[PDB]
Amino acid sequence: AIADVGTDRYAPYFAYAAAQPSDEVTTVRGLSNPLIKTAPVTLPFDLGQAVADNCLSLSGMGYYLGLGGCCPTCAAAEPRLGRSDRAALVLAYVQQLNSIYEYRVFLASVAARDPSERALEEVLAHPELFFAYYVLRDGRDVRVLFFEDPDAQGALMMYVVFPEKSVHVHHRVLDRLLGACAGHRIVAHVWQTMFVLVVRKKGDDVPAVSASDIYCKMRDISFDGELLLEYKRLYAAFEDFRPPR
Amino acid sequence: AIADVGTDRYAPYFAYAAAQPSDEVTTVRGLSNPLIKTAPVTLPFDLGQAVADNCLSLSGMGYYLGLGGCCPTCAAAEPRLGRSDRAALVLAYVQQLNSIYEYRVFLASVAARDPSERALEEVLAHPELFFAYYVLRDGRDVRVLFFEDPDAQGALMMYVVFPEKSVHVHHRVLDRLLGACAGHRIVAHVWQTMFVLVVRKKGDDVPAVSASDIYCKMRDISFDGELLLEYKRLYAAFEDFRPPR
Amino acid sequence: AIADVGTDRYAPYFAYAAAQPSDEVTTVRGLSNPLIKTAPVTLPFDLGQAVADNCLSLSGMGYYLGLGGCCPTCAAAEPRLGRSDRAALVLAYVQQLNSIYEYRVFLASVAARDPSERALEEVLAHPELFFAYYVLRDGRDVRVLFFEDPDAQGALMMYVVFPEKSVHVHHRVLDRLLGACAGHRIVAHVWQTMFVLVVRKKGDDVPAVSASDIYCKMRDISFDGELLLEYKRLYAAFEDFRPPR
Amino acid sequence: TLVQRLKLILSGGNLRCSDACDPERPPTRCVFQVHGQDGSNDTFPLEYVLRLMRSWAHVPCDPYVRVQNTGVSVLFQGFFFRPADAPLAAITAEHNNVILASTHSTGMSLSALDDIKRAGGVDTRPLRAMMSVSCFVRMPRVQLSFRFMGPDDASQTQRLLDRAEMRQ
Amino acid sequence: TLVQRLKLILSGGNLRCSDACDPERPPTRCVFQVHGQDGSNDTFPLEYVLRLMRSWAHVPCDPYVRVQNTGVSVLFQGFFFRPADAPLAAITAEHNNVILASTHSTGMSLSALDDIKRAGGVDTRPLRAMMSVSCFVRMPRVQLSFRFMGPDDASQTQRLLDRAEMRQ
Amino acid sequence: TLVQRLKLILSGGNLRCSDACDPERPPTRCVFQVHGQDGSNDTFPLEYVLRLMRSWAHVPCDPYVRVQNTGVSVLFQGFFFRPADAPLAAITAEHNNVILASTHSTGMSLSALDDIKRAGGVDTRPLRAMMSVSCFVRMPRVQLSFRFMGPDDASQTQRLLDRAEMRQ
Ligand SMILES: [Cl-]
Ligand SMILES: [Cl-]
Ligand SMILES: [Cl-]
Ligand SMILES: [Zn+2]
Ligand SMILES: [Zn+2]
Ligand SMILES: [Zn+2]
């Protein structure tokens, strides 16, 4: 009697649910409204902890991991990202790895830091970093910074610096971001008021990338002068950053 | 009277079908269940004899040309191959002809047999052979063998050796296979217990293939040692094969 | 009506079997007596066609593949072979591969044909041939002959010549024989009135066999003179044998 | 009048039909022209329309349909008599595939169809087993298959034949 | 409902079974899956369960069972109709052994079984001679034998058929 | 009998279920196996089926479900008692995400669920707040989220509990 209760208040319903199956279906389907629609997080935050319908929101109000289906900022973009065809999206950035001319923002970062072909070889060696940039461009005005990974084998890590003081990564966008960068860890940070996603290796069908051919195209291209200086200032600001392992 | 019958048993129905049109529609649409759902075949078997909804099944139980809509093995894969967009599928293997890095199984066959650039020139000269491999990979662990065609002008033929003792080509897969390889004859054979599809020329929008650039990429790539030895054993087993014209 | 019958005589029983489950159990278990207890075969006969309870019988009366559970010759030996522990039996001939001193009949064949160490190296290279001899010795007075396999890569085949004009391989014995010689084909033949099992390769945990140490032991051993001469006569009789592939 | 029926018969599928016949004196010329555009997978009820033509005529005949690849669509040409030289598919009941290259053609008459039906042990009872053409238009070729099709529910077909037998 | 019967039928042996069928409209998909682990020597009463499936259906059918080697156990897949391409053992009544390598499969339908039964001069009288599969699982292979099995006492079987005939 | 109910409960979603239990003596072995193929986004009503298992048993128990990544689909294994060593998710009511790599597994029992429910200040009144598993199959991983779900209209749920209370 003392161990039994406790609480035995479900027993009347389950007797009734056996007799009434058409009620049992509507009761189960009825339980659709989630009680917690957004929850706070702290930086540094591993994006791998977010599931397919989670969106990230970073601001002065705080950092939040919300449900996409109840999020107004996700709803506004939901018609724009409505296709969501991953067979085409995986083939898209695989195809766009071949031609990197339009993507000034990506190459400019290399041009500003170290404009040699050996630096361009080291960047093109990790094609998942371009995929990260391609995904985050679509769903706009991000900046990329390549640094050396001091707590790993001789390979580089990318910082994705956001322009605005308020940031919102759509659920479909970070679903694509995490899928495209399998074998890279993505963590969200803040540094000198700038939100930033560090993309480094943690532990694939890609075309063979000609480092010399793009290096030839680099000389023909005329970059925006104010964008290259921006990178030099941004590289200077992120030198003492030291993101934890 | 003697020539007349014979048999005149349809006449009552057709008189009735004239009076009742709504019955005539349901009677015609009603005749939907096909009496023969699969039929046996013998090897060598020309795959050109199979229509768009036919699937091929090869095993110890025998060789069969079945209807896809009544086939359980076809039904299981029908959600996976559900898009079936040929505009994108024709453009897919055309685009993937440019970048051959991921496709180790295809290149390894060339590497094992004859790793020169002249051998790679002769392979890349017939891009429909790669298309055949690309289609049969999607719908998995096949092996390809390039031999010389002794009953034709100086050009090579491909054998597609299946791994398992039971084989099943989906109806959509061999529809794509035959469509992609227009100008090549595909015939199914068996040799030393291994089922094999011989793809040779019988009697197009493709990119210009740089034989030297892929040959450069070949040296950088590190093949699986056990896969190259496998090919050497497989080439040794298929030397005295002699597939008929 | 014409297609229906045919014959519909089971319908009364199955209606009754639904009502009476305790009868259905006894009816199914009741069907235990097999109608065909032995069936004739012809030589050459591949022993791989025999299942675990099949026994082979070779005589002037003919060649037969019988069921062990209804065979009097199998029943007599069933208490002697009653343990049937394959964990110990696989470990037995693996252990007995180390010490080949008692097994005069096996080594004498090598001694008589070619008493060098290189011949002993070629024999000990195929340890499944000893396993075949070990199994067929237990369940008695067989003779072994090593010849070269002319329709395969440079490796030898063994003939197991039976002494008597009547032969009977127990079901457990040929179950063990086939299991122990996985990767060798066993076929039963007749040659100059002598029944013989040809054990050759068709297409494993074994100790490393020291050919020099056994070759040293061979010189110390004193063979039976009449057994070595027997082998010389037997090798002479089996020279023009030519067993088919 | 027959084209009204032929359009009704094909109304379930997506096969275009083109718009007189004397029952006592049936014409040797082409009676109907069914067209099927590239990409389609529609089914033509061959045995039905062939046996429909036999009932339409009061004089003895042997109805025939010609299947042709125009090099853009498929063409089914209807006839009351098989013209001189017109092709017949050598197919059996089990092996029934015919591929057509551009401009090539095959066909089937009621009499040759009856030979195939009897040779394959197929059920001759009305509407129980009916030959139909599954056509797939994969340019430049036209893929045809002369398959026998039965009803999903035979008990329904047997009751329909009683309804016709009642009104007689 | 059939799985209840199938488990009862196999309760004497040690063959695991996996847990709806409409009598008017029988499904083309797999109906049951019997499994048999490595080392076992159990017997599957093939002809019984095949003829059980025929009585279960009120529409004409040809029941079929597929025997497969998974590469760990044996698999018996039940069907009301033999699927397209599905294998049939070429065995006779006297020569009835089939060895299966890993992933390979064979099978048997009621119609092909009747051909074998009549061709071998086997007794067609109910429950006097019934095909059953003796299977031995000797990894990596699966050894099968399609043997006809009769009753130990025929006089008992004849009296059981009278008990069924009485209740009708 | 429970699988009939479990299939009915999951009939709204697209989660495959696999086909006896004694109310007095409940088994320690696995009771049901729900499967969810790659690409799907279906929701498993965990708290409902857990509390359904408690009512099913007349002897005291602590029902448990195990969620596993097979490396192709998701697997939900039902139990009346949590087996020895079987995993429990450390999640709270607000922080409830669990990612599973290939072959890895987590689970949840009714007792550990009650601790989480009381610790988060969640409404314990019947059917007002119910834990459910949102699962996304993004190969090679399986993404799980143990979210509490309430009804869209609470006034409807309160009237349903009166209908059950009336019949008693
Ligand atoms: Cl980081
Ligand atoms: Cl060929
Ligand atoms: Cl031999
Ligand atoms: Zn959002
Ligand atoms: Zn198929
Ligand atoms: Zn015996």
UniProtKB/TrEMBL annotation, chains A, B, C:
<keyword id="KW-1048">Host nucleus</keyword>
<dbReference type="Pfam" id="PF02718">
    <property type="entry name" value="Herpes_UL31"/>
</dbReference>
<keyword id="KW-0862">Zinc</keyword>
<feature type="binding site">
    <location>
        <position position="55"/>
    </location>
    <ligand>
        <name>Zn(2+)</name>
    </ligand>
</feature>
<keyword id="KW-0479">Metal-binding</keyword>
<protein>
    <submittedName>
        <fullName>Nuclear egress lamina protein</fullName>
    </submittedName>
</protein>
<dbReference type="InterPro" id="IPR021152">
    <property type="entry name" value="Herpes_UL31"/>
</dbReference>
<keyword id="KW-0597">Phosphoprotein</keyword>
<dbReference type="GO" id="GO:0046765">
    <property type="term" value="P:viral budding from nuclear membrane"/>
</dbReference>
<dbReference type="GO" id="GO:0008270">
    <property type="term" value="F:zinc ion binding"/>
</dbReference>
<feature type="binding site">
    <location>
        <position position="74"/>
    </location>
    <ligand>
        <name>Zn(2+)</name>
    </ligand>
</feature>
<keyword id="KW-1043">Host membrane</keyword>
<keyword id="KW-0472">Membrane</keyword>
<feature type="binding site">
    <location>
        <position position="168"/>
    </location>
    <ligand>
        <name>Zn(2+)</name>
    </ligand>
</feature>
<keyword id="KW-0863">Zinc-finger</keyword>
<feature type="binding site">
    <location>
        <position position="71"/>
    </location>
    <ligand>
        <name>Zn(2+)</name>
    </ligand>
</feature>
UniProtKB/TrEMBL annotation, chains D, E, F:
<keyword id="KW-0426">Late protein</keyword>
<protein>
    <submittedName>
        <fullName>UL34 protein</fullName>
    </submittedName>
</protein>
<keyword id="KW-0597">Phosphoprotein</keyword>
<keyword id="KW-1043">Host membrane</keyword>
<keyword id="KW-0812">Transmembrane</keyword>
<keyword id="KW-1048">Host nucleus</keyword>
<dbReference type="GO" id="GO:0044201">
    <property type="term" value="C:host cell nuclear inner membrane"/>
</dbReference>
<keyword id="KW-0472">Membrane</keyword>
<keyword id="KW-1133">Transmembrane helix</keyword>
